[PDB]
Amino acid sequence: AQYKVIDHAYDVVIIGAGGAGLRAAMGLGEAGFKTAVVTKMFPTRSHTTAAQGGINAALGSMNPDDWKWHFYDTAKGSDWLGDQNAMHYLTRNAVEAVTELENFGMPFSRTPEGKIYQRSFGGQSNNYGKGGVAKRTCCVADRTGHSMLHTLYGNSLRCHCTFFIEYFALDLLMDKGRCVGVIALCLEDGTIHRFRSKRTIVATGGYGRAYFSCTTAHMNTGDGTALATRAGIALEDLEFIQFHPTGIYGVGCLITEGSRGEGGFLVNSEGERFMERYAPKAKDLASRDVVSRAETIEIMEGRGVGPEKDHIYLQLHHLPAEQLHQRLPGISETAKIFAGVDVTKEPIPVIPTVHYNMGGIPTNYKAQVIKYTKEGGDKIVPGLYACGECACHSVHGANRLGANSLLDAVVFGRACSINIKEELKPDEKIPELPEGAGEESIANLDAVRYANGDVPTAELRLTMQKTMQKHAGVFRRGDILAEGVKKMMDLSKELKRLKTTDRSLIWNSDLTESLELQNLMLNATQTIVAAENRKESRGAHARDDFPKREDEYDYSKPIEGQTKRPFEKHWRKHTLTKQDPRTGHITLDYRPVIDKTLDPAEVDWIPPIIRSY
Amino acid sequence: KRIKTFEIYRFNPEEPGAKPKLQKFDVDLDKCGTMVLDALIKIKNEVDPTLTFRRSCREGICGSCAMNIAGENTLACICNIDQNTSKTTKIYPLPHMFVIKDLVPDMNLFYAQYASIQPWLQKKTKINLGEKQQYQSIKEQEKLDGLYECILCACCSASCPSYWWNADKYLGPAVLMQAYRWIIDSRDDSAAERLARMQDGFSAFKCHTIMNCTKTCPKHLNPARAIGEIKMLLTKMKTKPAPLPTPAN
Amino acid sequence: EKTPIQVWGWDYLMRQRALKRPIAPHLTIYKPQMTWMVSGLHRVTGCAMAGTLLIGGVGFSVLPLDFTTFVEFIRGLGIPWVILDTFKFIIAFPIAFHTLNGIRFIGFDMAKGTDIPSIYRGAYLVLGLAALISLAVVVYPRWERHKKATLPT
Amino acid sequence: TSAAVTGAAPPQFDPIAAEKGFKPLHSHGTLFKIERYFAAAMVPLIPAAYFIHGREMDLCLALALTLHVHWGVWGVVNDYGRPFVLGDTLAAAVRVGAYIFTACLLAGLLYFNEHDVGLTRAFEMVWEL
Ligand SMILES: *Cc1cc2c(cc1C)nc1c(=O)[nH]c(=O)nc-1n2C[C@H](O)[C@H](O)[C@H](O)COP(=O)(O)OP(=O)(O)OC[C@H]1O[C@@H](n2cnc3c(N)ncnc32)[C@H](O)[C@@H]1O
Ligand code: HEM
Numbered sequence A: 001a002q003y004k005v006i007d008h009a010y011d012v013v014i015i016g017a018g019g020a021g022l023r024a025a026m027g028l029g030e031a032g033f034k035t036a037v038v039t040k041m042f043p044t045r046s047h048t049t050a051a052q053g054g055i056n057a058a059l060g061s062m063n064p065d066d067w068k069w070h071f072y073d074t075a076k077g078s079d080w081l082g083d084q085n086a087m088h089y090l091t092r093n094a095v096e097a098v099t100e101l102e103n104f105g106m107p108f109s110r111t112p113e114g115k116i117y118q119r120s121f122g123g124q125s126n127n128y129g130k131g132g133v134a135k136r137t138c139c140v141a142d143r144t145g146h147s148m149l150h151t152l153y154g155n156s157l158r159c160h161c162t163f164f165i166e167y168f169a170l171d172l173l174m175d176k177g178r179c180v181g182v183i184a185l186c187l188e189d190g191t192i193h194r195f196r197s198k199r200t201i202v203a204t205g206g207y208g209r210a211y212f213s214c215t216t217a218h219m220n221t222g223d224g225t226a227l228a229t230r231a232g233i234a235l236e237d238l239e240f241i242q243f244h245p246t247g248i249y250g251v252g253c254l255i256t257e258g259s260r261g262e263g264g265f266l267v268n269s270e271g272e273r274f275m276e277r278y279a280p281k282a283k284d285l286a287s288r289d290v291v292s293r294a295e296t297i298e299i300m301e302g303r304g305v306g307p308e309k310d311h312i313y314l315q316l317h318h319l320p321a322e323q324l325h326q327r328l329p330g331i332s333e334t335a336k337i338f339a340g341v342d343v344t345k346e347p348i349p350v351i352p353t354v355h356y357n358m359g360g361i362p363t364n365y366k367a368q369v370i371k372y373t374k375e376g377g378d379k380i381v382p383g384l385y386a387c388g389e390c391a392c393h394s395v396h397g398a399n400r401l402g403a404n405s406l407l408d409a410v411v412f413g414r415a416c417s418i419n420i421k422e423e424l425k426p427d428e429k430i431p432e433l434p435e436g437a438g439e440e441s442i443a444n445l446d447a448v449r450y451a452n453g454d455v456p457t458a459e460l461r462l463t464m465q466k467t468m469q470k471h472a473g474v475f476r477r478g479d480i481l482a483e484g485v486k487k488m489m490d491l492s493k494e495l496k497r498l499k500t501t502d503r504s505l506i507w508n509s510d511l512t513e514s515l516e517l518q519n520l521m522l523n524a525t526q527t528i529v530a531a532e533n534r535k536e537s538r539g540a541h542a543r544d545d546f547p548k549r550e551d552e553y554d555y556s557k558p559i560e561g562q563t564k565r566p567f568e569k570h571w572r573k574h575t576l577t578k579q580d581p582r583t584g585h586i587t588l589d590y591r592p593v594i595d596k597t598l599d600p601a602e603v604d605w606i607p608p609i610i611r612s613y
Numbered sequence B: 001k002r003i004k005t006f007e008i009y010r011f012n013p014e015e016p017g018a019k020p021k022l023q024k025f026d027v028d029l030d031k032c033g034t035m036v037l038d039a040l041i042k043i044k045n046e047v048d049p050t051l052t053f054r055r056s057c058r059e060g061i062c063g064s065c066a067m068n069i070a071g072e073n074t075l076a077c078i079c080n081i082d083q084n085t086s087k088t089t090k091i092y093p094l095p096h097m098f099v100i101k102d103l104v105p106d107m108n109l110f111y112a113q114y115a116s117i118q119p120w121l122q123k124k125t126k127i128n129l130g131e132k133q134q135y136q137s138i139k140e141q142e143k144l145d146g147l148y149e150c151i152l153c154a155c156c157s158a159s160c161p162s163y164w165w166n167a168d169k170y171l172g173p174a175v176l177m178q179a180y181r182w183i184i185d186s187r188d189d190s191a192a193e194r195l196a197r198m199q200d201g202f203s204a205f206k207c208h209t210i211m212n213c214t215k216t217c218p219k220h221l222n223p224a225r226a227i228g229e230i231k232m233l234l235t236k237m238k239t240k241p242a243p244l245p246t247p248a249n
Numbered sequence C: 001e002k003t004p005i006q007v008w009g010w011d012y013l014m015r016q017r018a019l020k021r022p023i024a025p026h027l028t029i030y031k032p033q034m035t036w037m038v039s040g041l042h043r044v045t046g047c048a049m050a051g052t053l054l055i056g057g058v059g060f061s062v063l064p065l066d067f068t069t070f071v072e073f074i075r076g077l078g079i080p081w082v083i084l085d086t087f088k089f090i091i092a093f094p095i096a097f098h099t100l101n102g103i104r105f106i107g108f109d110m111a112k113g114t115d116i117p118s119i120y121r122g123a124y125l126v127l128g129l130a131a132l133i134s135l136a137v138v139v140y141p142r143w144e145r146h147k148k149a150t151l152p153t
Numbered sequence D: 001t002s003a004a005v006t007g008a009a010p011p012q013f014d015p016i017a018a019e020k021g022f023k024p025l026h027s028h029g030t031l032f033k034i035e036r037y038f039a040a041a042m043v044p045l046i047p048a049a050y051f052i053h054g055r056e057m058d059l060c061l062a063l064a065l066t067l068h069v070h071w072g073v074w075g076v077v078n079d080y081g082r083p084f085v086l087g088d089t090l091a092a093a094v095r096v097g098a099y100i101f102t103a104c105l106l107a108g109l110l111y112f113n114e115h116d117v118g119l120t121r122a123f124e125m126v127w128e129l
């Protein structure tokens, strides 16, 4: 049939209003640009609002602390797969970033003295890895992500940036390596929109919904990363899928690490803190990629708990109801609601769940999207930025440190602002749409609308999610993945036997079902192959058949006189998947990890070591 | 085997000469989650994909899945399905909202009203943004409890006949809840001029203390309490000021 | 005069009626509750009494049929004592309830006792309390109208 | 085709661009303060009348009872009688009929305690039947 199309012309457009989305939105509005924020739900509904634990920063409102020790842990937890510059950026900016939010009016919990309250979290440690556990996470008791996100939204009105809400971003506006704007659908009345813009930010959160079980939203299908792929951008580190240790057994609701941070621990059928075995130092507060395995083992070996011997207990009843009600209000509730459990009397049934994606769209410390060749390094795609979860600066590398993400969404959002208020020529004007432009995105829609297939939008989604869980799991063997990639590639082929029912333009949910599948095929398929091709065991990634972490050297034994292994023999590299969407065919380059700081004079880089907790 | 049945409001806006109606769905409680939302999701996947509503968090915190279930306004994602299958549960959208499609209300007026109360900190002594914290003691932030938690579900507002009758001129409990939120923050300076914006007849004084607001808040919050406190400030009793930021801060 | 938002609100409703969008069901579907029903009854009683006092002063003036005569062009109609004695109760109950429940609604208007349990006790404490005063106002005179249908010595 | 219109930015409220010319600090607070004190202090009154009858009673009950009711119904009218449903010109008319109701009442009540039994007595008589 036929469609209504509308044209908008904005300086900058932001795709998504999460934490990262809003922190940008307000930076530009503030310096006076004609922003537009496109999102597919009222901003307060973004997954950021479920965030619980906190945000990391060295204010030391509890005990002296240096932003340097935080940088340490970030690089450590990253299992040296992060870019050390980004990690540098992140960590000096973190004290401002947070306080900025206390000035914007966030009701952070408070120390008696009067300053921000802070709690301890998984992975972190004082004095460059030789002190006690650091208390570096700032938090609104248990509601930290929620409280923050309202605050940003609250302030997002103070600076006039036009919100296009309940709008679905279909694709980017591509002019041979130049991003001019976005195409989008308006749920409320079926009208298609085009957004001429000088600049474009993609900030759309992870793809946690690729799996059967996840701690994420129903809305978290990583359609950002879909846009880069269909714009011909290479995606990176899609094999680094964090599993969060304390998912709630039945549903997949998260129980914040902050509960371990505050004292409560893990227990197996035997009635034993098994973390004393797997992490003699950090105990129940190691990094999550470790802890998640500790559980996945315990279970595999029949020390699991319940009537199914297949999850474990998180125990907190040994703690004062005072501290519990006050430092952990929200979890106390969700415990009671979904598990039917009182944290003062019993333990909670918990089980590692797919949580965060350290993968995403490739960028520098300046948060600008980049293509890459061996031939001439990394060519920046101008007009285009990315931040948050859909981003990959690689401040996380192979394993994300906990409560560094709200951080990296505040900071690299804020970087998106500062680094456009820096290089925008108040001279030259808004990019033009090519003739007949956008027309291919809509074309997809059309056939997806009237799609007379024979497998339903929903049955497909399910099967893929089951097959992702079985294969791209916590522990991955070689012949599993290869058999995975097998099935999976049949599925990214099943998309032409697709059945749909609601033919309507207006609030067609069956149809944003379908687009949101399409956009998760491209995720999952790239996720799984990249996983398969990696023959090492670093962070989120673990192989049954390659237990060792392959670097240039072998940093187990002193360096003196060893021979540097060639770039192709080792695996300290970012995986870069391309896929052509027509075919759905994945081919894999490999970018080098960036190992240098931003100011050698201010801080010294950290050379790879053995990963001990 | 135990079969639950559901009555669900339906409106197809694109269809010519359009009428709302109740549609009936049978659901296998053995093959289903414990929550109402669960049941909804089942029948989009397994009986009817046209059935449309708003959802995100599933953990009861986004605020999207707000609606009226067996007569009460609450969150579908944290609403236990009535086990007894002799009785038929009935689901409707937030009362007296203008409906877009099926269970999907126009939320815009609500949103605007949220905006109009200026939901951000403002200071007479303008401050360096990245620099040191603002003092607030623990006694003073506890004051903000039961206030910062509002997930903006609009449950309370859609449950207040005042607000049905005069949505337009009357702010509503969700929004005044939040207005108060800002006026009583010991780091806000606009406290006097915030009250200024609602001194009129319909902005806050059109609460008749029906109380429906508090009885209904899925988040166990207390809008009326707030409203009460506002009316006071609008007349007799006063806001406190800060204790001074202690030396060595 | 309207605050800027009230103005916005107006246009919104204009916009929304302009699209012939439906209103979501409300009194028809909302669940009977003690919060709103009391409040409701409070108007009712409120207006019942005022309606009385209107057709009162006005009726009896615009009419050549004064009170005294009315009072017994009802007494002279073999009316059984109980039936008369709930008609009194009925009249007494409005005035009883609107007054007690009235004081309650001042607390609320001052954020006193505005939490579900304290809300719910009041609503009962006062619904029952009125029903009580009300009943003693009706039945106790009726007691002394039998205690003197037989004085002992 | 992508041969279509250039539209606008969907209706939104901007709370700061609105703060421009608009302050009129006209506070119904004080009135509200007193209409609540009124009923408050009018409490000991209503039981007094069960105890003490007579002719000064009738008349101040009436007095007070008018004021409360006036205020009250004004409140009732601004609730149920409103522009969206009624259209503006008829909604004025009800806002007037409010004051007609106070007058029809008080003048009607005045009459009663002059050329009929009184209020206190009208009750007395109904209790003895
Ligand atoms: C799942 C989770 C994550 C989490 C956490 C607890 C849970 C349950 N707790 C955290 C914590 O305590 N500390 C921390 O540092 N991180 C924590 N996380 C991770 C972190 O919260 C998230 O990754 C964070 O949300 C990152 O923010 P981001 O902005 O990138 O993600 P988002 O807010 O969910 O983004 C969603 C926005 O993008 C828009 N979008 C998505 N798709 C579209 C399309 N198709 N079209 C238009 N807009 C789109 C969304 O609609 C939304 O506005
Ligand atoms: C001292 C005794 C009384 C008290 C304390 C009292 C209290 C109140 C209060 C607080 C309201 C405000 C309703 C609201 O906006 O929430 C009200 C309303 C009203 N009152 Fe009274 N009242 C008393 C006696 C009466 C009597 C005897 C009558 C009738 C003759 C009456 C008639 C009304 C009417 C018609 C309203 C309309 C507003 C509404 O119902 O919401 N009042 N009363």
Ligand SMILES: CC(C)Oc1cccc(NC(=O)c2ccccc2C(F)(F)F)c1
Pocket (backbone or CB within 6 Å): B160, B161, B162, B163, B165, B208, C026, C027, C030, C036, C039, C040, C043, D079, D080
């Ligand atoms: C069915 C329930 C939820 O709702 C019903 C619907 C119809 C009107 C009302 N009750 C009122 O409407 C009412 C009662 C007392 C004071 C103020 C009001 C007011 F202002 F108008 F909202 C109750």
Ligand SMILES: O=C(O)/C=C/C(=O)O
Pocket (backbone or CB within 6 Å): A051, A052, A053, A054, A254, A255, A256, A257, A258, A356, A401, A402, A403, A404, A405
């Ligand atoms: O433990 C949590 O709350 C999760 C934190 C995170 O995702 O960073």
Ligand code: SF4
Pocket (backbone or CB within 6 Å): B149, B150, B151, B152, B153, B154, B155, B156, B157, B173, B174, B177, B216, B217, B218, B219, B220, B221, B222, B223
């Ligand atoms: S006070 Fe409660 S019912 Fe009201 S908007 Fe907030 S969360 Fe919803």
Ligand code: F3S
Pocket (backbone or CB within 6 Å): B159, B160, B161, B162, B163, B172, B173, B206, B207, B208, B209, B210, B211, B212, B213, B214, B223, B224, B227
């Ligand atoms: S229901 Fe409305 S009347 Fe006030 S008490 Fe709640 S806002």
Ligand code: FES
Pocket (backbone or CB within 6 Å): B054, B055, B056, B057, B058, B059, B060, B061, B062, B063, B064, B065, B066, B075, B076, B077, B078
């Ligand atoms: S969908 Fe988040 S509140 Fe139910």
